């Protein structure tokens, strides 16, 4: 059980590192105001285990030499 | 010999006995060889008509009778008015099939002679090999020699009718150039020179060029430009000069291997102009410029550039050298042996902008050619002070601008020379013409990799002039890209960063066009604003807010 | 042990919860180019246990960007006036290369020999 | 094995017909799951199963049985038969009239899982040829229920069934674009209102389906055009032009084109 707990702790550490990096990127791109506005247009579906983003269909994501004129 | 001073009883014998047709043709040749008898021969009626009548079918078996076709109408064809009688008697049209079926029969002879060597397995000096083979070889040599002469004089009459546009159009309708190129395979100087003169005469027009292009000429002329006859090389080089205009023909020339012989002819002859013009036309694409430096062009071009004593050096050599200088492989060879020093000396002893263009093109490159240029900043900078018209200062300025070595401290040059007040003055929209101002902007950018000049640039008031220039020249992507690149130069030197951020509205102009149509302008804006964001947080917040209002613009419009 | 494991699993659920939040927000609202830029710039600091950024001006590779060759596609930067003058005038002053316009070799007089 | 199972199933359904015996139901359960598992991703198995006309003749009759699990399993089997079927298999499936019995059965289906299977099988079949769309539009109370699955409040909060309904409606709207009666019975339930909202939906498939429907219905009639104009479809249709997904882009652009040609005059 000690190995299982150690692996779980390592998973927590990796997940925390990853999400901290993600927040870094979201800070250099999206302002805090629009981070908050985005959070009001997203919902959690527990049955499927995935997010839901309303309006997912509206998100943002001559000098060539030509000497042919000489001949008539 | 039967020298005569009269007429009749000679053309009379030309339609009654085959063996004596050739002797009569030779006698007519001797009669017409001198020019004083031409008028009497022309006034002799039913004389050319009888020759044409015996000429319409007796040109396929003897070959010696094909001498009778011309050498009499030849001396007629040397005068303009007799060309009307030439179309009257239609010697051109019969000459057409004359040349055509002689070429056909020459190929037939080639194939029988080639297949007669197949009997070399058993040689017995009889009909199998030798004996009759020797006889066929002898009559071959006689027939081919006389027929080559006959073609020489026949196409000679063809040139003497080629002066007219309509006559040449009729001649080109008959697909001359095919058999013309076929005749180029023969080995005899004079007929070849008539062929190449005729072909050059046709080579100005694009219709005859298009009839020429399908069958290779350049490969046939490759083994011929080292020929020993001067007029041959002259008119052949003129013909290649007419053939360089077409791009496809020029790639044919490059792939066949015409360049080494062209450069050899450019070595030292009376063919300087023509060979050098041809070589320059080949240079006009980037692919062929690199093949020059592989011991083909030879650095002798620099030699005859150095010798030429005049106020204005000849245009052709300087143009060839300039277009050679577009490529680093030629540029490295140009500066070999320190030619750039005498290049300076010539450039500065007089106002010759063309050598300045050549060395400017030399200086656009990263290699050691850039490194050598560090020593010429004062000598160039002296003439930068608006001394010799305008067509000279631009080249000096631009040559200096491309001299981007990060280790070279420029403040000495700016305070001694370079007229920083004139740099500011030129940035006025109404000061000078736009190319000079753009070169000044390249200068302002290239003086900014040195920290010592940062304080001078910040104090000089150049930034307002740059901003006004950007505002007044925002339409063209070149000015915008280069000014924004100057801003990129000049931000992260710790002295002009503060001015740009807090005194001028430049980062706003960077916000407005963060994402423009052109990839380069947008890339420069992105890198400059990325460098701005670290030292200033308000412009960073605005940098997010804009381009977030653009990245998801329709999203926000739909929510609103 | 069961209670601790359940609490830890709840922690994992919430961690991937917010991680998916960030991933979806990036995958809908953030371009790939800016993600790559920030990924190249950033670096993790083990001492302070948080992610940091390498400043551009303080990067080890302080070698500066190389000047654009041309915004209009030439071999060198070119003013619009220079392009117009290249198009209309035969003045070699505005061109890098290809400055001479040779003429077609006009056909001479036909008199050589024989 | 596949042929043996299909033979046993068809002979059982022939010799017992529609029976409520539990053992027969369990045997047919085994057979149906076996066919669904065996036909998944095997084109050759699909062709072999569709070459047996008696098999699917036995299958289609099973849709009318009282057990809705049988309905769901037959729907899944017809799904995997109709998915990317060849010309012969499509024609053979059309011949046995599976479309009619499937879509009638959906009206009587009460379980969510069975309804999902049936509507998904209909969506797979509805793109084969215009005859399937004709049979879909010919059943009584057909479109009135097809529109009813768009606003379906799923018990398990899944968007499968609404995606299926949007896909079927897009597929069959080509015939709905030609007859006034079908458009009228669409207007009776305010279908356009549920179609426009689908543009802002959480699922991209739903947006694509809605764009397809808006493309199909807005063309060649003034009444629906002005109805869409009143509800402001022009703004959301214009915003969707530059989408990355092909179907969404074409649907939005074409719908805006049809609306553009009928500006007030």
Author numbering:
A (entry chain A): 569 to 629, 645 to 655
B (entry chain C): 129 to 688
C (entry chain B): 562 to 675
D (entry chain D): 469 to 733
Reproduce text from the manuscript describing this model.
Heterotrimeric kinesin-2 (KIF3/KAP3 in mammals) is one of the most widely expressed and abundant kinesins functioning as a complex of heterodimeric KIF3 motor (KIF3A/KIF3B or KIF3A/KIF3C) and the armadillo repeat (ARM)–containing adaptor KAP3 (16–18). Notably, the tumor suppressor protein adenomatous polyposis coli (APC) has been identified as a KIF3/KAP3 cargo involved in RNA and vehicle transport crucial for neurons, accounting for ~12% of KIF3-associated organelles. Here, we present high-resolution cryo–electron microscopy structures of the heterotrimeric kinesin-2 complex (KIF3A/KIF3B/KAP3) bound to the cargo protein APC. Our findings reveal a previously uncharacterized KIF3 tail hook-like motif, termed the “HAC” domain, which mediates binding to both KAP3 adaptor and APC cargo.
To this end, we assembled a tetrameric KIF3A/B tail/KAP3-APC complex using the validated KIF3/KAP3-binding ARM repeat region of APC and attempted single-particle cryo-EM reconstruction. Ultimately, we successfully reconstructed the structure of the core ARM repeats of APC in complex with ABK. The KIF3/KAP3 region in this map is highly consistent with the ABK map. Based on the cryo-EM and XL-MS results, we found unexpectedly that the C-terminal ARM repeats of APC bind KIF3/KAP3 specifically at the ABK interface 1 region. Within this interface, the 310-αB region of KIF3A plays a central role, with Val624, Ala625, and Tyr626 from the 310-helix inserting into a hydrophobic pocket formed at the C-terminal region of APCARM. The KAP3 C-terminal helix also participates in the interaction of APCARM, with Gln682 and Met686 engaging APCARM. As the αB region within the KIF3A H-βh-H domain was not fully built in the final map, we incorporated the KIF3A tail–linking loop region from the docking model for further MD-based free energy calculations. These calculations revealed that the KIF3A-APCARM interaction contributes the dominant binding energy—approximately three times greater than that of the KAP3-APCARM interaction—while KIF3B showed no contribution to APCARM binding. The structural alignment of the HAC regions in KIF3A and KIF3B reveals that the presence of Pro616 in KIF3B induces a loop reorientation following the β-hairpin and prevents the formation of the αB helix after the 310-helix. The wild-type kinesin-2 complex exhibited a strong binding affinity to APCARM, with a dissociation constant (KD) of 34.7 ± 0.6 nM.
